[PDB]
A paper describes a structure:
M proteins form parallel, dimeric α-helical coiled coils which are attached to the bacterial cell wall and extend ∼500 Å into the extracellular space.
The structure of the complex between M68N100 and C4BPα1-2 was determined to 2.5 Å resolution limit by multiwavelength anomalous dispersion phasing using selenomethionine (SeMet)-labeled M68N100. M68N100 formed an α-helical dimer but not a coiled coil. About two heptads of this N-terminal segment (aa 58–70) bound C4BP. The C4BPα2 quadrilateral contacted M68 protein, although with some variations. The C4BPα2 quadrilateral hydrophobic pocket (ΦHis 67), instead of contacting a single hydrophobic M protein amino acid, contacted a cluster: M68 Met 58, Trp 59, and Met 62 from one helix and Tyr 63, along with the alkyl chain of K64, from the second. In contrast, the M68 HVR utilized the C4BPα2 quadrilateral, albeit using multiple amino acids rather than a single one to contact the ΦHis 67 site, but lacked contact to the C4BPα1 Arg39 nook, with the C4BPα1 domain in this complex almost entirely disordered.
Author numbering:
A (entry chain B): 42 to 78, 81 to 131, 134 to 135
B (entry chain C): 29 to 34, 37 to 39, 42 to 43, 61 to 108, 113 to 123
C (entry chain A): 52 to 127
């Protein structure tokens, strides 16, 4: 007879249990629902592509400057050797 | 073809927060707390319900707030 | 009360299952983004090497051109 009072007491405390841990997980689930969106990854890949392209452009310009610098000194050295054979006075 | 969620989901239903506890009343959950579901409100004996009787998880949040009993 | 306890148990067990699905969804998305960034840097480093290879090959070609230039000037 007293069992029925124990079943309703256990069911009431169980109902207040599964509801309470739902409230805690429902608050944590909202933090997981927000961190899903996506934009942080799209912006991370876009930010790395800009820095990587700034490296390819600064290196290519530096190599193009050195290649143009070499050709300038070669054209000037050949013009100096020409002015030397002209002076070489006999 | 790359699609997008209209709902929340790496190649389901969105969920509404807990509706709370209605003082001197009862909050009946018909299905779940997800998008599209609805809940019902009732007041205790001798209490008038001031506000909405139902509320739906609309696009997410509850369409109607918590009613009042007296 | 027994029906109330079973409802909140079934609603938590679904909240617990969906939480694990969202956790694995963000874990796989975070790992795929790291793999995409690794391929971006690996594809990059291959382009830096191509710039250095072309720079050295052109600089080496210019040295050989100046050798054939003087040899053609001495003969002429
Ligand atoms: Ca993420
Ligand atoms: Ca409740
Ligand atoms: Ca009444
Ligand atoms: Ca380099
Ligand atoms: Ca030639």
């Amino acid at each position: 007879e007293e069992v029925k009072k124990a079943e309703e007491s256990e069911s009431k405390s169980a109902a207040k249990m599964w509801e309470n841990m739902y409230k805690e997980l429902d608050r944590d689930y909202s933090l997981l629902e927000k961190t899903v969106e996506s934009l942080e990854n799209m912006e991370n890949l876009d930010k790395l592509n800009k820095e990587n392209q700034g490296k390819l452009e600064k290196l290519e310009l530096d190599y193009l400057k050195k290649l143009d610098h070499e050709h300038k000194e070669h054209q000037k050295e050949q013009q100096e050797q020409e002015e030397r054979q002209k002076n070489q006075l006999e | 073809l790359k699609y997008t969620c209209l709902y929340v989901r790496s190649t389901i239903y969105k969920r509404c927060r807990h509706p709370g506890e209605l003082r001197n009343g009862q909050v009946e959950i018909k299905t779940d707390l997800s998008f599209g579901s609805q809940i019902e409100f009732s007041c205790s004996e001798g209490f008038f319900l001031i506000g909405s009787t139902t509320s739906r998880c609309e696009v997410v949040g509850w369409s109607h707030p918590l009613p009042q009993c007296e």
